[PDB]
Each structure stands twice: as structure tokens, then as C-alpha cells.
Amino acid sequence: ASVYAWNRKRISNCVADYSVLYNSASFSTFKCYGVSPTKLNDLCFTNVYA
Amino acid sequence: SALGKLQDVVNQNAQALNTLVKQLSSNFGAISSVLNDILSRLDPPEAEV
User: Fold this and answer.
1) Which residue of A has its CA nearest to B44?
2) How far is A2 from chain B (nearest CA, A)?
3) Is there a smaller number of Cβ atoms within 10 Å at the N or the C end of chain B?
4) Impact of changing residue 39 to F on the protein (chain B)?
5) Are B16 and B10 in contact (CB under 8 A)?
6) Is the CB of B1 inside 8 Å of chain A's CB atoms?
7) Which residues 3-32 on chain B approach chain A with CB closer than 8 angstroms?
């Protein structure tokens, strides 16, 4: 959906796999703020939102 | 209350030590006050700042 009612997916009780996310080259802009692009497979987040 | 001069020095030293310890709970403008978090969440080129 466009930016008027932007969807919000609350992911929980999972095992994230950002390693296959930032190593697919199917993205044009991958900028991480607060955290580094890598070093995300060694962290355990409380609540993530897509 | 007679031994007040001897207790004041101990109290001042304890307050100085407690303040020096509590000064480690501050970020001083950073994102966290723990070096481990900064080093495990940021890359070396961006964590030195």
C-alpha cells in the first residue's frame, strides 16, 4: 500500500536471517541507522516492525 | 556525634567514589553507556565516533 495507511508487521518469536537479506544484491538502498549493516546475526532484538 | 571530623572524611571519600562510579552510567551524547553494546551493534569505522 501507498503511504497513507502504511502497513506494520510485528514479527516475533522467530529467527531472523538478515545475512540472506543484505547479501542478495536485490536491493538499491540498504542503509542501517543505529546498528551496522552487518553484525545483525549476533543480536537478539525484542520487537521488530516491518 | 563526637567523632564527626573522622566520619566526614570517610563520607566525602565514599561520595566521591560513588559519583565516580555513577559517572559510568552516562552516555555523554552517545547512543549508550556500555562499550560492549556500541562494539556489538556498530562497525569499527562508525563506532569510534
Assistant:
1) A36
2) 31
3) N
4) In strain: Omicron/BA.1
5) no
6) no
7) 31
